Design a protein around this ligand. Structure first.
Ligand SMILES: Nc1nc2c(ncn2[C@@H]2O[C@H](COP(=O)(O)OP(=O)(O)OP(=O)(O)O)[C@@H](O)[C@H]2O)c(=O)[nH]1
Ligand SMILES: Nc1nc2c(ncn2[C@@H]2O[C@H](COP(=O)(O)OP(=O)(O)OP(=O)(O)O)[C@@H](O)[C@H]2O)c(=O)[nH]1
Ligand SMILES: Nc1nc2c(ncn2[C@@H]2O[C@H](COP(=O)(O)OP(=O)(O)O)[C@@H](O)[C@H]2O)c(=O)[nH]1
Ligand SMILES: Nc1nc2c(ncn2[C@@H]2O[C@H](COP(=O)(O)OP(=O)(O)O)[C@@H](O)[C@H]2O)c(=O)[nH]1
Ligand SMILES: [Mg+2]
Ligand SMILES: [Mg+2]
Lengths: 116, 431, 49, 431, 431, 431
């Protein structure tokens, strides 16, 4: 799951140098230390205990197919350099309209730059 | 030294046996008569006084005619006459008949024959046991066999290669009753399973090998390649030798979740190798394309909990780590939260051999991948759906009750799978 | 024709087939031993000596 | 006189150990048959350090090759220098662990560790004055990480005053070849801090880089990787075998590298590695030898020392040098980068000179360095272990050996006090 | 390393791909089987496991017969079989069926083939995409693929060679509807365009190449010459090379203005080239001539905003500059006020190659030009004129709605193009 | 001793420096292999200034080639003097900046800044006494103008007192080869004016002027242009490499040329440039050098000093001459042309003499002049800046990189404050 840091050798495992020319997973560059040992958090067969707090994320990942993906996807590259005030807003609202698309693993993470 | 015994069960198991045991003859150079015309074959064969080598296999069936073909085929003198065990009457697509009435007749005979193969070997590594979830013998008798093999060998590995019901096509109507009941045994009396349905290999063969009209002998050969690359490190030297006990530990996170998925690549024809470069990057991406898993499921809708990689041939630790690192830096794949390092790597030297009359071209490198994933959880939900709507109105129950098992096993077997589906969900919830 | 050093080594395994392995070592009479001195090496070819 | 008994554990230990023995055999001119064929007299003045005398003018390595699986050792036997090792030294069981530390340390190790102890106690009592032992293994396995740690535990009880080094291999962050790697890693380093004089942390992924960018090999197999680590094990004991202007040995670094008994984890690196195109454009000098030595890319572990502070440094040298130049460089590097060197010890670096260079090379050097950047390797491993151990993942294999859960709790606790006490020395005031 | 992937769509895409790739093989020297009887070819071809070079191209069409002509052509062995992707039924001049219903079938498959192609590339510069505004597959699917390409590949360039429909001639009735809808989708999901209508190339071939009865091949050869010169700086060296990134930045001044106009010169016949010397000045004045643009719009009806120059052949840097100075000192060519320096010049060495049986006489020097201007805004005006008077009666929309797209999408798409004309007005006003 | 590390950034940076290293290799008698084949002692006495030493009597340049696109580096390595450079010093990324200063300075130019800092740190600490560094690039590009400014801002912080020259190329008004050229030129002088010690403003159209009119070459390639620039880069440091009657270096010129830290922009010029026919009618005398030396048509910038005041002037002579005639000739031009020299500094001319002439030539001289006629350049750019910047054009490329808008406003302010500050020294009273 979590990708760690090769420190000096991180250049060798950057996503583009590994010929993976798509959006990729983040890199956990720094970590902290844990004092003492750790309590058992699951019983047999890997079920979480009643007392522990659990996430609300779906237990089956988050992947969108073609027929599930929204019919009008705004682009990833958004740049507000000469847009009118309202034309800036309808573009920004359009991206935020569907919260499922931005949150999926296969879904796009948009970039936004500039003000009208 | 390392030695293994194959416990092929059923018409599925016997016909699989012809494909794989032919492959072990060409790999080692053993003639169909049984002599080499250098001791590299002790794990599967075993020599006698006359110089002949007899296989370490036990073909079992409850009806004669499949094994009868083996007794008069090309390799009739290759196999010992005693190990091809049959029966006069079979279960006929019935778990109960193959578990309580007809199985108990010849259970004792085969449990003597297994011992007479066990004592010849010094270091047993495990038992490769092949059966099918569908037919009566592959479901019933093979389930009894694991129960009595557990008590006689507490610690020995019991690998379980299986044929799982296809999602749409099936050659039996009562089969969902069969598949539900036998999963008790492969839950508490097995160490690893390799469920694979035929419809996936039907799809893979015609999509990749261009054979638009396949047959079971085509399918039997790919399964022969999968078992071959599992035991290749046991058989020939490798940079990273991987044993049977190695990947049993590094595939099963919990005793009730021991159901990985097989994946083989490349599987391409001779014309399609004439245009295509093969490098370790280009075949290890094929292990994660959802179009190539030998079960009809998508890992993109689940998350991997353990993946074991089996390289073979002209492969270098150069390309292995670059390809694995490229796999990790992908947002498409999902790993469970508790498993940050979920890879087991095996590197071997001897490239896969080519059988004449086969379908694949001969290649310089290959891979097999075994990935325990929670995306298989979808298969039981459909299986428990179809078992439900048949058992809601007591269809076919009179056949099983008449054989002499209580009906309380039917309801109890449904709940264990009901609990097992929730198991595959709680591992999907991260804290 | 090179002196033995890191970087000065070339494999002979290119194009070699039959990477078979022999059963050197093994137990006889419950005693660890090298069973048989006359078995060949990897590839089914004779050893040195 | 001053003898070294070469211990050996597991597949990583055997393939490292197989390459190591041929490396010094070229150094001492020992042919595959085993007899003296070298020319100079200094090639036979201290050969008893590693070799034992046999009749007929034959030399026998003082090696103890240990492995639970008999078949890794036939690949050792079938190598170029295969028949140079005495068969009575080969010790093997029948059933392997399968990357399982619990199997190799408690249940199956305890049956094999009697026989290896008889071998070393025979090898110890043979020579007059042992300097100490030396074991090569890996922490991510079952035998080397398993039984190999119980060996070190037992020798220190028998032989408290002798030294005991380890060229272990620690698992890497980016690519992992075993899913139970952090289970075996933490359960092993807890043993290393208690009974060990020196440890050398090698990572295959750091060896991967140097073959790629410093030597520029197109297809670096594991033989070249095993060559690099053996070139380091030669560089530490070289003054023990050849004369020098400034002498050293294995104990001269031990007293001088270890400021407190808990901190004995060092990071080696080899100096004269140049690509075959770079040999054309270079100058064989001592200022270049210190430049490549201290460069962070040249490290063979998986941590950047520029994050931490260099506690102590040891740079041993080979070849006939001028000792103004080998002394002005080390004052130069301590002064220019004053931030990476702790202040409460002025003159952190130790130097040694051996006249005889490695065979076929003019000048060479070997770097040993203790830094407060190794702590990340425990910090990363600990949370790779906490995330696994929270959910009881892969615990049935380990708790099926009968061990309680509280050895793991005291395993991370003895890992985590270290990183705190390691981090305190980094944040320490001089005055 | 300089690499481009071609994503040719539709009958225009396939027939252009035949002429374009026929040029590339003769340009490098690849025999039609795939065998070269210099790593420069890696920009388009990829080395394989037999000694071949297979293209980095993806031909897609929804009707089989256009692609089947390739599969039985001269180059049946050059192209990998997997790359040529077809379907049973075609969109049949309909955006809706090409976008929402039948385009969505093969969007998953062609995304996988593109991914494998992009995996093999080392540094891919961008994506070259050829299609048409008229056909359903060339417009409906290519809009869907462009939209789904941006989410998969955010930053990488997506160039769009395309066929803008004609003012006077036409092969279709419905194409005003199809052309309107696809600019709205691809306005925010595109980077550059090079629209070329066929009559504008038709008159040039008639007037200049003597061919009074041309066919689509004579046009497809000329289109290939444009694509050859764009990538020429990647393939072979030059005095001032250009990339795909370089000329996208210097030709799109505002986020919604990405419609340059291509121009090639010289284009003369062998008998007409004998009488006329060709110098740098002669052909660079031909690049600005209204009679020679392959868009039916006279830039005397507007103002240039950016001009990208692509020189090639026996050219001298001093004479490129003497030519541009003359071009500026003529008010027939008028520039905007906010782009005082509106040129981007590149120089390449290799003279353009000639295919036998083609049209152009082979020449020592050649020029290509990509001039963005507001004299294209009149072309959108006539297209809205053709879109209006069909839309008032709601003709043909029963087809579109019956496929599964709402009529409210018709009004929004025309409204955006209503804004795009006013966008092209404000930049053309001087302050 | 007294060394120079030659930096190199961009396509203009590489093809300039590739010619430059060839130029001085002939002066120091270096074959393409890299060995010394000269005759006189003085050709190998101070070769350590530019060349590093290696085994076998070999000399590698102290150069650092940097480019974001690999395409330019390939043509450098394939020249005659292409294998002389050390392979490690080549540093390069995967994708280009596309003439975008923002792309080259922040987004991808930062990933490449860590490695170029390592090579520079490698060469800087080898040389015992480093006089300074030297860079050649272009301000109209993406990486030379882009990342090339980032190196300067970083190296100044590490090595403050060392000299930092740039032989940059400033854009030309009459013909421009980049549309977005004004933006990169403005944003880089703002880097230059803060972080530079001396700057030379070489312009290509001035070089086109000289090749057409002075040398009268019909076909001047860019190689001939790169010969002209290098003939100055040798003359700045020739007094550093060969002894003379009155020596100098970079610092003697730097101290004596810039009266205030803000003003460090000069115009180079090379004296003995004669056409082919003119060679017949000439006589090598010092006055004939000076007559061509100060002629405004010999300048290699686009500004006539007849429009401004010569602040301070350098002339570095090369050849065995008389100290009377060289002194009387700088005297005569200082009295005849009284108005073009400032009035608050007497004797505005700095002279130096190096005895060894350039190879194959008898006499030569070099011109470095500082004047207020160089504000003719900066006002010239700012008009082309505010024209584009009023409409916020070509800005989404820049503001899409994450940079804000105040950078443009201050960069014009710093640029426009400079010319107002430059203007007041033109209009200055002495008393
Ligand atoms: N993959 C694969 N499946 C097979 C093959 N042969 C038979 N099967 C499967 O076997 C199932 C039928 O049960 P069998 O194994 O043939 O018969 P059985 O196990 O002896 O049980 P009975 O028929 O009651 O005697 C079918 O559903 C097939 O899917 C084979 O060659 N390959
Ligand atoms: N320039 C040029 N245009 C072409 C060529 N072939 C087809 N076209 C144009 O393509 C338009 C029709 O679309 P097609 O490409 O033929 O068909 P399609 O893209 O598969 O779309 P459908 O017909 O709906 O399946 C015609 O109006 C032509 O103008 C060609 O070879 N060159
Ligand atoms: N450096 C090096 N490491 C090796 C070699 N062979 C195996 N390894 C490492 O050893 C680990 C697995 O060793 P393993 O066979 O499980 O050791 P064992 O359990 O003691 O037998 C892996 O992490 C490998 O990276 C080798 O030849 N060289
Ligand atoms: N005088 C001269 N100028 C050159 C040469 N090569 C390139 N240039 C100039 O460099 C500018 C473009 O540089 P560019 O390639 O964008 O630099 P980069 O982006 O840093 O790689 C052009 O304006 C050319 O005039 C040369 O050999 N001589
Ligand atoms: Mg049956
Ligand atoms: Mg069509």
């Amino acid at each position: 799951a979590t990708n760690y840091s090769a420190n000096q050798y991180e250049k060798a495992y950057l996503p583009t140098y590994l010929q993976n020319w798509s959006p990729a997973r983040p890199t956990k560059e720094k970590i902290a230390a844990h004092e003492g040992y750790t309590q058992i958090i699951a019983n047999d067969r890997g079920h979480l205990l009643p007392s522990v707090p659990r996430s609300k994320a779906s237990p089956w990942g988050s992947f969108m197919g073609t027929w599930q993906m929204p019919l009008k996807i705004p682009p990833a590259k958004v740049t507000l350099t000469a847009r009118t005030t309202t034309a800036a807003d309808n573009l920004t609202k359009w991206i935020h309209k569907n919260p499922d698309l931005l949150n999926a693993c296969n879904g796009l993470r948009p970039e936004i730059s500039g003000k009208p | 030294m390392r030695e293994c015994i194959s416990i092929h069960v059923g018409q599925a198991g016997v016909q699989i046996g012809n494909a794989c045991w032919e492959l072990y003859c060409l790999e080692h150079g053993i003639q169909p008569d049984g002599q080499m015309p250098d001791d590299s074959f002790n794990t599967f064969f075993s020599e006698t006084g006359a110089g002949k080598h007899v296989p370490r296999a036990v073909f079992v069936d409850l009806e004669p005619t499949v094994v009868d073909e083996v007794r008069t085929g090309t390799y009739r003198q290759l196999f010992h006459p005693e190990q091809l065990i049959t029966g006069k009457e079979d279960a006929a697509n019935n778990y109960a008949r193959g578990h309580y009435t007809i199985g108990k007749e010849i259970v004792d005979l085969v449990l003597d024959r297994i011992r007479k193969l066990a004592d010849l070997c010094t270091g047993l590594q495990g038992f490769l046991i092949f059966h099918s979830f569908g037919g009566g013998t592959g479901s019933g008798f093979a389930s009894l066999l694991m129960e009595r093999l557990s008590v006689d060998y507490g610690k020995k590995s019991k690998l379980e290669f299986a044929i799982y019901p296809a999602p749409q096509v099936s050659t039996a109507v009562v089969e969902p009753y069969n598949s539900i009941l036998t999963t008790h045994t492969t839950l508490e009396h097995s160490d690893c399973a390799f469920m694979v349905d035929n419809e996936a290999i039907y799809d893979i063969c015609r999509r990749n090998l261009d054979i638009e009209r396949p047959t079971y002998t085509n399918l039997n050969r790919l399964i022969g390649q999968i078992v071959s690359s599992i035991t290749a490190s046991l058989r020939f030297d490798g940079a990273l030798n991987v044993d049977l006990t190695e990947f049993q530990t590094n595939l099963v996170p919990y005793p009730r979740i021991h159901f990985p998925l097989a994946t083989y690549a490349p599987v391409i024809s001779a014309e399609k190798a004439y245009h295509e470069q093969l490098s370790v990057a280009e075949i290890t991406n094929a292990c994660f394309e959802p179009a190539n898993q030998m079960v009809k499921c998508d890992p993109r809708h689940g998350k991997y909990m353990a993946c074991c990689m089996l390289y073979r041939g002209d492969v270098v630790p150069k390309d292995v780590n670059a390809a694995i690192a490229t796999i990790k830096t992908k947002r498409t794949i999902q790993f469970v939260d508790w498993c940050p390092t979920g890879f087991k790597v095996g590197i071997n030297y001897q490239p896969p051999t080519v059988v004449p009359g086969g379908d694949l071209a001969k290649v310089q490198r290959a891979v097999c991948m075994l990935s325990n994933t929670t995306a298989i959880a979808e298969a039981w939900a459909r299986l428990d759906h179809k078992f439900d709507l048949m058992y809601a109105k007591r269809a076919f129950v009179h056949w099983y009750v008449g054989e002499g098992m209580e009906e309380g096993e039917f309801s109890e077997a449904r709940e264990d799978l009901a609990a097992l589906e929730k198991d595959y969900e709680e591992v999907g919830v991260d804290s | 024709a090179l002196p033995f050093l890191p970087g000065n080594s070339f494999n002979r395994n290119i194009g070699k087939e039959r990477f078979h392995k022999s059963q050197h070592w093994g137990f006889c009479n419950n005693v660890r031993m090298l069973v048989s001195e006359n078995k060949p090496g990897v590839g089914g070819d004779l050893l040195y000596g | 006189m001053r003898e070294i008994v070469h211990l050996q554990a597991g597949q990583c230990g055997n393939q490292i150990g197989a390459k190591f023995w041929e490396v010094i055999s070229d150094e001492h001119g020992i042919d595959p048959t085993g007899t003296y064929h070298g020319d100079s007299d200094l090639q036979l003045e201290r050969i008893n350090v590693y070799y034992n005398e046999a009749t007929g003018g034959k030399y026998v390595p003082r090696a103890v090759l240990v492995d639970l699986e008999p078949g890794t050792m036939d690949s050792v036997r079938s190598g170029p220098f295969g028949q140079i090792f005495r068969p009575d030294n080969f010790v093997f069981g029948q059933s392997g662990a399968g990357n399982n530390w619990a199997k190799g340390h408690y249940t199956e190790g305890a049956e094999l560790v009697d026989s290896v102890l008889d071998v070393v106690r025979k090898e110890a009592e043979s020579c007059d004055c042992l300097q100490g032992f030396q074991l090569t293994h890996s922490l991510g396995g079952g035998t080397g990480s398993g039984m190999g740690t119980l060996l070190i535990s037992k020798i220190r009880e028998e032989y408290p005053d002798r030294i005991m080094n380890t060229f272990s291999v620690v698992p890497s962050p980016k690519v992992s070849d075993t899913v139970v790697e952090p289970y075996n890693a933490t359960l092993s380093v807890h043993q290393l801090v208690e009974n060990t004089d020196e440890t050398y942390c090698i990572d295959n992924e750091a060896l991967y880089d140097i073959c790629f960018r410093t030597l520029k090999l197109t297809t670096p197999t594991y033989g070249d990787l095993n060559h690099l680590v053996s070139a380091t094990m030669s560089g530490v004991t070289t003054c023990l075998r050849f004369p020098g202007q400034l002498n050293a040995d294995l104990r001269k670094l031990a007293v001088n590298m270890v400021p407190f008994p808990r901190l004995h984890f060092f990071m080696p690196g080899f100096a004269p590695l140049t690509s075959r195109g770079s040999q054309q454009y270079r100058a064989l000098t001592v200022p270049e030898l210190t430049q490549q030595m201290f460069d962070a890319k040249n490290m063979m572990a998986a941590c950047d020392p520029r994050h931490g502070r260099y506690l102590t440094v040891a740079a041993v040298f080979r070849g006939r040098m001028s000792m103004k130049e080998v002394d002005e460089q080390m004052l130069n590097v301590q002064n220019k980068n004053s931030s990476y060197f702790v202040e409460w010890i002025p003159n952190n670096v130790k130097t040694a000179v051996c006249d005889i260079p490695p065979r076929g090379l003019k000048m060479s050097a070997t770097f040993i360095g203790n830094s407060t950047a190794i702590q990340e390797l425990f910090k990363r491993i600990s949370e790779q272990f906490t995330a696994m151990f929270r959910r009881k993942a892969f615990l049935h294999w380990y708790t099926g050996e009968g061990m309680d859960e509280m050895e793991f709790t005291e395993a991370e606790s003895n890992m985590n006090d270290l990183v705190s006490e390691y981090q305190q020395y980094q944040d320490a005031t001089a005055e």
